[PDB]
Design a protein around this ligand. Sequence first.
Ligand SMILES: CC(=O)c1ccc(N)cc1O
Ligand SMILES: CC(=O)c1ccc(N)cc1O
Ligand SMILES: CC(=O)c1ccc(N)cc1O
Lengths: 281, 281, 281
Amino acid sequence: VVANYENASMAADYIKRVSNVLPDIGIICGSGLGKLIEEIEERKVIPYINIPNFPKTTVAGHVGNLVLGSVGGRKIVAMQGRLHMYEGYSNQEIALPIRVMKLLGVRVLLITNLAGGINRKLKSGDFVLIKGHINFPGLGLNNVLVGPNQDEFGPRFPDLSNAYDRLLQQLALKIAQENDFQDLVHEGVYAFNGGPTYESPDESNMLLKLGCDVVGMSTVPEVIIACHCGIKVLAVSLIANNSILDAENDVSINHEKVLAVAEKRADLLQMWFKEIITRLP
Amino acid sequence: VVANYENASMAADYIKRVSNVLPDIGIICGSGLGKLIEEIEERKVIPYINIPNFPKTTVAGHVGNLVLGSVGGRKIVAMQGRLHMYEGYSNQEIALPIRVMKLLGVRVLLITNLAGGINRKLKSGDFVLIKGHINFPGLGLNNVLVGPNQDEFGPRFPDLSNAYDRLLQQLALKIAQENDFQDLVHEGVYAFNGGPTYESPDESNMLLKLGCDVVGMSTVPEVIIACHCGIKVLAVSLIANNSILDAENDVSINHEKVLAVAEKRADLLQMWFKEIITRLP
Amino acid sequence: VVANYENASMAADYIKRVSNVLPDIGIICGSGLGKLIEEIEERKVIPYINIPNFPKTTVAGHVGNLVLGSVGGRKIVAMQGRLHMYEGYSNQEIALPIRVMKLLGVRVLLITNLAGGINRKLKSGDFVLIKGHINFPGLGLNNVLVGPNQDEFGPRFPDLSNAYDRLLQQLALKIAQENDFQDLVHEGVYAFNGGPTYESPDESNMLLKLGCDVVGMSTVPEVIIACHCGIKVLAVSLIANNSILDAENDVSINHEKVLAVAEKRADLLQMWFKEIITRLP
Ligand SMILES: CC(=O)c1ccc(N)cc1O
Ligand SMILES: CC(=O)c1ccc(N)cc1O
Ligand SMILES: CC(=O)c1ccc(N)cc1O
């Protein structure tokens, strides 16, 4: 199934009938960082499998819902269970849920992930406002837009120089200052590693030479589809570990350690993003 | 359809019956740089869709013809509308038209493109004679030769160290000197970005560290297929913008700006390549 | 055919019936470096085509056998004819023979290849003990583990920091010292170029900046599948040429030159690996 105009419209039709909500904000939350979704007010939970033309996710398993409702007086739609390209999803499967968000009325997309720190100023538990990216799959002919262009959504050759909105980064920092946790908040460039193996010690050393600040396995595909169709983006990484230090000390990273950092910071991240949503222009 | 000996021979059979021309020069022109094709003498225009085993190009649309005839007393074949890998064409679809050129008698292939400048000496409107390349898709398991080797055309493991003929670069520079536009003519290394998103500001900064002089989304696939089967190559980039300056000044690039630079330099490029064809040993 | 538990078990069932050998060591030998396989004692040769669920290899052709028997008192299984991803094999086709090795009882995998030297200390004929890697296909969304995870074999997100066993590297060096050829033995980081074109002169210059010591077109896919399912690895590169010197002197590399270096060092490599097998804890 192609992520074209007609197919995205059929999905949006279904969601409009079932939910009644006209959202103008979208959210995609990282692993263990979804508690906010469970506090959406007057909410409607829609399993992906029930939505016409949504990608099939039963081989990977685990939760996969679209959730609609209100936060801080604002109307939102959330993906509960994001799709990752290391599972083998095609470009068309990744793009269709974002293009459905567009047809529902979304103008701002908020994204979180966990990632490895490369910059030596970054420690476990820090937050990074993403200001740019290095897309290794894109350079290497696996860009999420490889394929025919869907002209109704955007141009054949997008410019990504303003993909990460500057004013949204400033608002996120202002709220951190108001609550006295700005000592945790950095900015930086996100490198996309297709995955699912963590960056090796020698890959980490290479990434430091190349000017990467953080590295992870998500986010860049969704950002590019959102930028293509004119949706503004704020993206924030929660640092699980510093991979350069770990290489010097022969320390390993694993998913259990990642989820423990998520649980340690989840409630503060929930509070932060609730206020961002409330304050959005 | 595989780009093998039998399939390429069937296409060449058709072209020989229809055209009568035995070319020994091939040309592939970049976007907005095709005016020379319209001045080919005693010419024959063959739509791709009419040629047995040629790749289907109707999803992308736009012009797609093979054109045969004479320039400067020399017999040539031109691709009018090149195939780009960001459209989703397979390795086999890209390679078959070049291998048909080989079976028709082509010994020299001339290529132009538009590209972004990375080297700080490059400005909008400059020309770069390509002397080498950095193939990010190839390093990342998307080389145009991934697949079974077609032994009749060339070896399993090609060496690309002489892919860009030195004497053809010297002839192109000599002609620029004769017409007093050598101040526009540089040499450099071409980085292949699969695309279709332009290099981001942070990707551009990385490319400068890596020794790239220019970056674009074409040319390297055709060069590798030509080198594999023993065809000599001259490739020239027309610089649309300097992406490093643009990153420092928050300036964007778009296809309208690219085509305006093409129109500004098209007639000089036409004059240049006509004389190169005329002078080829 | 997926490289899952049930399919690998069906292949292992067949091999157990035919061979009688319960191996705990696996070997994969590089081009021209397979003489040891022909001296396996009380051996059984099994063509891939006869084994249920093994990948089809007839398009590429050439030898493809599984060989089981005894070396130095130890029970081994060898792949005679390795699978290379530049042939177009899928992730599932590469992984299934390694996962069959696991089900047969393999705990240690020994690997050789030929490769190009990047570090200026490396000459034709030197050996490099691999201590880490830089996986350009993995960064670029062509990792051998892209797809659903096969949970019975290993975790969704593997850590590769101990993929190359330190004690096996120490044993290999000790044996070289015992036989007075330690002057040939280096250690280093292996870059994976998907291939099948050799690194270009300008790609070689880039690899030196990035901290790569050697570059080749194999090994990293098998290492990652072995590490995923808990098999220890020793991997050794035989240097065919120094690609940085060759770029400075406009010297080419080709497969004939590669095979001549293999023949020059084959007997010493056979002696070395026989003793390693004999001495394995
Ligand atoms: C969640 C995720 O993708 C991730 C987390 C930690 C890390 N060092 C690298 C990663 O890619
Ligand atoms: C024509 C083309 O591919 C191209 C043009 C300008 C640029 N900065 C990058 C590009 O890739
Ligand atoms: C056997 C092989 O893959 C190989 C050999 C020599 C070389 N300079 C590069 C290579 O990739």
